[PDB]
Amino acid sequence: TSYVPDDGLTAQQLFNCGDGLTYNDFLILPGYIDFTADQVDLTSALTKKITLKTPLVSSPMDTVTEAGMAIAMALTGGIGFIHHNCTPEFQANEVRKVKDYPLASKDAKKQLLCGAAIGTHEDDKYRLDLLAQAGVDVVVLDSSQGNSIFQINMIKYIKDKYPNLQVIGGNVVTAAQAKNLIDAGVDALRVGMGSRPQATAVYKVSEYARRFGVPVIADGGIQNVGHIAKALALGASTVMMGSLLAATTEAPGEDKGSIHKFVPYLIAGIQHSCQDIGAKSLTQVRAMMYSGELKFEKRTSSAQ
Amino acid sequence: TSYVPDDGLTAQQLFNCGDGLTYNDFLILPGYIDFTADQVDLTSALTKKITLKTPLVSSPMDTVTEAGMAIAMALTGGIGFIHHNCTPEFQANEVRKVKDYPLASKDAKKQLLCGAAIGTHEDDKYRLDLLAQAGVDVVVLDSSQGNSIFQINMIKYIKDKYPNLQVIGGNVVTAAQAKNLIDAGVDALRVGMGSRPQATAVYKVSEYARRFGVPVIADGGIQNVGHIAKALALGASTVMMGSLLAATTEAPGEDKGSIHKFVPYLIAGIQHSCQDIGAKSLTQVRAMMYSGELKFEKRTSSAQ
Amino acid sequence: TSYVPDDGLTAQQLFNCGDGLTYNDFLILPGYIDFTADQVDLTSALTKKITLKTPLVSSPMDTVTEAGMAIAMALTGGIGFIHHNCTPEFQANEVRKVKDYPLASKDAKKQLLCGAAIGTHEDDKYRLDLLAQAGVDVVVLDSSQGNSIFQINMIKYIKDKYPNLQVIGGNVVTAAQAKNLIDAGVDALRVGMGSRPQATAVYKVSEYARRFGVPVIADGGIQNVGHIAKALALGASTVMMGSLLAATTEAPGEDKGSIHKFVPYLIAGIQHSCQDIGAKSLTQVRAMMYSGELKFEKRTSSAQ
Amino acid sequence: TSYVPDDGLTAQQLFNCGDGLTYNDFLILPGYIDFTADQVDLTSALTKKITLKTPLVSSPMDTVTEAGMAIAMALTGGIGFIHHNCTPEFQANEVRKVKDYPLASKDAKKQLLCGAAIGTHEDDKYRLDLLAQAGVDVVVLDSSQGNSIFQINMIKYIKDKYPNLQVIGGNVVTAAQAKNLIDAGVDALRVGMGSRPQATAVYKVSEYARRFGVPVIADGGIQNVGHIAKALALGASTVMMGSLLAATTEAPGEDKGSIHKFVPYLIAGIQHSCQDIGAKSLTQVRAMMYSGELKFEKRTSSAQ
Ligand SMILES: NC(=O)c1c[se]c([C@@H]2O[C@H](COP(=O)(O)OP(=O)(O)OC[C@H]3O[C@@H](n4cnc5c(N)ncnc54)[C@H](O)[C@@H]3O)[C@@H](O)[C@H]2O)n1
Ligand SMILES: NC(=O)c1c[se]c([C@@H]2O[C@H](COP(=O)(O)OP(=O)(O)OC[C@H]3O[C@@H](n4cnc5c(N)ncnc54)[C@H](O)[C@@H]3O)[C@@H](O)[C@H]2O)n1
Numbered sequence A, B, C, D: 001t002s003y004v005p006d007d008g009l010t011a012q013q014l015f016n017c018g019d020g021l022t023y024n025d026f027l028i029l030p031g032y033i034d035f036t037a038d039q040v041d042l043t044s045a046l047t048k049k050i051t052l053k054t055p056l057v058s059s060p061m062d063t064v065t066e067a068g069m070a071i072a073m074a075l076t077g078g079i080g081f082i083h084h085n086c087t088p089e090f091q092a093n094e095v096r097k098v099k100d101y102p103l104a105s106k107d108a109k110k111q112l113l114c115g116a117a118i119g120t121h122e123d124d125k126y127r128l129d130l131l132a133q134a135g136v137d138v139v140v141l142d143s144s145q146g147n148s149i150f151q152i153n154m155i156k157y158i159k160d161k162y163p164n165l166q167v168i169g170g171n172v173v174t175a176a177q178a179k180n181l182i183d184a185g186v187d188a189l190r191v192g193m194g195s196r197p198q199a200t201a202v203y204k205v206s207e208y209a210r211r212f213g214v215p216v217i218a219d220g221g222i223q224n225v226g227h228i229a230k231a232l233a234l235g236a237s238t239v240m241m242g243s244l245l246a247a248t249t250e251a252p253g254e255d256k257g258s259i260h261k262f263v264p265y266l267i268a269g270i271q272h273s274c275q276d277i278g279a280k281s282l283t284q285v286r287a288m289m290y291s292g293e294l295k296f297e298k299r300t301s302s303a304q
């Protein structure tokens, strides 16, 4: 005998089905473990040409990221984006403060990476110029809705006035929006609006974006390691966290400890999560769910 | 490449599908922004021949509307209906108290608009006569269920004994009910009963009513700007608010401030909401959802 | 034009559809009002040969029914069943205490009706004999699950040793169970177990039972007038209430007032509910939902 | 007439349907009672060659099972597994402490049964050797995810170095995982991970495992007698309880009383539950749901 029929759903049937799901609406069926967790490689792609030893990224929120944070984040394997809710002069001053840890994220010159947010209005161009000076590695046009002529133009701009600077498009949740931002020439995409339901939004935008070599950043909703694993598993290349970090020490302010103990923790969990599903890298988990090897299963409200 | 398949649901498939939805059961997928929010025109139709610079309307509730309120409402772009839970003499006295702000809603003689509720019994005819005198612009046969012979007759009555006065039909939730009220000759419709689930009720009654040129007032359930935008987007021409206003200053009684700061706020949000979905007027948003350009997506309970 | 397509669901499609619904899982679409509420006739059938001027019935619970209650209930239009959680001698003593109000429920000799619960074991036969003496009108074999050989036999028994006494079968939720109890010869049925979901249970058991002329008592879950109206509308001939009454004065013990003010209230609401849906009697409401004139609509969890 | 159509769902349609259900997502339709509860035989199979007079099994949790508990459990009809969160020397010392009650679970030599958990790493082999000495009856490779090469090998090991010792495989939730553990040669299976949703997990793994004569232990989620009955009814041969017992007296620590009063209680309820559905043994309940005689019905979130 020994034939075993066939597990649950395939990412496709589940996230193209008038569903509209969250991270908590489904679980993932385990696989075959035949190696240890510490062998799981979490290397991820932040933008077409920026790569991290971990998929973690902090949010451009005054209550979250600022030099202090941006630094730890990079030392430990991630990267941070400074909030533009301050004087342009104050922001670029943060960017420069930032500019053993085998994982440390560094530029082509041994320096910790740093990114920062900027609006899509005129006055922002100046801010940009200060930021570019302080040696910023990447910029993220920070908007709740990004499929606008005001972002498309700010993109075509920066893409020209600064060819070696990587640009990340404003928040989108459909492939109809992503198209435009990818034509204007963005180097990555920030997915999230309402935290459309997140999981379904990530699934959809990644599925289109990969066809062009554009990474996707799962932005919003991450509450625990689980959500992170589910967000990567659906297509996201990296994950952005806001509130889940606002209680660390490196956070600007008056729970948890330093980013130097928390981040390691997260990385541990995530590899452990990649073991349970029998994948050795994150790249492999994405390949599995697109092929149909990785199976899922919905949970009822009362089943949560 | 660059083809992008096709977004979520179309208002139709979603609100004719044994669903029975609320404002919180679904979200709307964003569109293409290529203009500023302050360019969004919120002009709406209260009744076949009454038109406002904003879709806002206050409720005929003693805890909400009375002269003071009715006035602000009109100065700012809306309109109010005085509650008939008082002596006929007291009600019409409110109507007369009422009878820069470029938006100010005015009659053909520079006077702020005013409306008021009245029952469908005999004794109400008198009340009417006092109200008509004080110069009331519109009357709304105020009932929990309006598809009755007692309203059909009160309609045919008022429609005759007062040809220049606009009549709004009592609360309905189906197109089977709306038919009768539209034949008796109402000039508009008040949709809501149980706050059937509201969103599905608005969708349905508007879809039928538009075929006759009869506006629909989304009555009940509005808790925040979002619900307002969703209610208009489904077909409603205007929106009536009760409790969301009962905490303003212009409200009769012993949170929030004056209607002169709140209303502006609401108008701001609503245009902003119309931007996110790429529509320039409310008229355009309705045209988009009826055509199938505007897309939606359901959220699970646990996805809320 | 004026054609109006077609309202929601038909009781059938909705309660034979792997649903498993509660009273709160759905609402009923309004109809055409063309008469006043006080014209609604609430006459209902308790058992094949017992008939009440209202569908109300109190529960055989020590915390609810006992002589005092049983009396009010009948004076006002209902009927009560005394709890058998006491000495047989004490129970029959209650039955005898019981043995203007135009609605008053009376026997063929001007006496208030009274019913009472009894087990299905040997010792219960004696209890019965005392009860029959005190002039009890009806008996209800009181069990959580009634499709047993121990009830079938207690039925065939009582049906013989007392031909003029009406017997009500123990709690069932399927038509598979009802069959047996109806063959043993019961004169009515008590539906409810888990308060299977109630609404679906009532629907199902009534649909089968009517084919034999056996009334059904919706037992359990009634929290407000609404549930009562929905329970009758689904097929139930009468409704049994436990906790909703335990806070009246006529209740045995140390909220609400007397049954003489509460019951009237309930009757008022129920007629009002029968108006909203355009039915003049309860008999008519049942006829409407079986024909397909009466329409329903499900509500999502988040739509409740 | 008297034909009665056909009850609800069949375990199959319901637990192979992209559902993902919990114990609370459904109920079971009653059957035909024609015998007393105390006639219900709860004999169950713990492992291919271990059999208990009741399906109860305590959890390998320091907050739950340890000698004291393990003993009561066996005296009353169940069995316990000592937690390996202690020195190997301390664990085997518990096993030996353990090594009228007609139900008492005993070895071939009049001694109370005892089982215990052990990891799947090298160092665990030693622990094993101490445990085997103290006369342990069964071992349960204790892991959150069991489909690993590290468990498959620890199985093939123990199966050889100790032929008369019964081995239970680490936690699984699919038949894809169960296959491997059954080939390595386990004598039973522990189902549960996330407490995939439990009910659906039990259903699935039992359905495959029975084809090989391998019992399944429903592990996790049991909160009351009901869940226990539903877990057995779906295919499980026995049920493991953690927290529901942590408040007994026999539990290690500083609610409820002794296991000698609680367990009886549970057994009583469970037979009563087997009566309501007309089954005389647990073996019969499983046979009924696999044949399609036993019917179920889903409940909406708002129907819970
Ligand atoms: N990530 C998210 O989804 C999210 C949610 Se709230 C949030 C944060 O909240 C902020 C506010 O959201 P907004 O939609 O206001 O975003 P943004 O700050 O981009 O402002 C959008 C408004 O700015 C206008 N605008 C931009 N450039 C313009 C120009 N050159 N000329 C004329 N009008 C122009 C837009 O048309 C629009 O109404 C965002 O900047 C971001 O920092 N992000
Ligand atoms: N908008 C809503 O959905 C809603 C919910 Se409660 C609510 C407010 O609550 C009030 C009460 O709801 P009701 O259903 O009682 O509404 P209404 O005040 O219209 O009264 C309805 C009752 O009045 C009777 N009636 C009306 N005219 C009659 C006449 N000429 N002869 C004989 N009977 C007549 C109806 O037949 C019915 O039973 C409403 O008037 C309204 O102010 N509105």
Ligand SMILES: NC(=O)c1c[se]c([C@@H]2O[C@H](COP(=O)(O)OP(=O)(O)OC[C@H]3O[C@@H](n4cnc5c(N)ncnc54)[C@H](O)[C@@H]3O)[C@@H](O)[C@H]2O)n1
Binding pocket: C119, C120, C121, C122, C142, C143, C144, C145, C148, C150, C171, C192, C193, C194, C219, D033, D035, D036, D037, D275
């Ligand atoms: N209405 C309801 O659904 C409901 C829920 Se609880 C509830 C009340 O709780 C009480 C307990 O529920 P039960 O299932 O125990 O109901 P009941 O009091 O009918 O007792 C049932 C038990 O009594 C046994 N029994 C009855 N007659 C017997 C006889 N002559 N010989 C041998 N065994 C016999 C049954 O086989 C069964 O295990 C009910 O009597 C009722 O008063 N009613």
Ligand SMILES: NC(=O)c1c[se]c([C@@H]2O[C@H](COP(=O)(O)OP(=O)(O)OC[C@H]3O[C@@H](n4cnc5c(N)ncnc54)[C@H](O)[C@@H]3O)[C@@H](O)[C@H]2O)n1
Binding pocket: A033, A035, A036, A037, A275, D119, D120, D121, D122, D142, D143, D144, D145, D148, D150, D171, D192, D193, D194, D219
């Ligand atoms: N029953 C359950 O579902 C459940 C949930 Se939490 C839980 C308890 O929590 C504990 C922890 O869960 P874990 O997944 O850590 O389970 P376990 O204690 O089996 O440890 C698993 C980790 O140990 C590693 N491992 C095992 N043998 C190894 C070997 N010989 N060489 C190299 N690596 C090896 C695995 O590859 C894996 O990453 C379990 O042991 C159990 O006691 N059980």
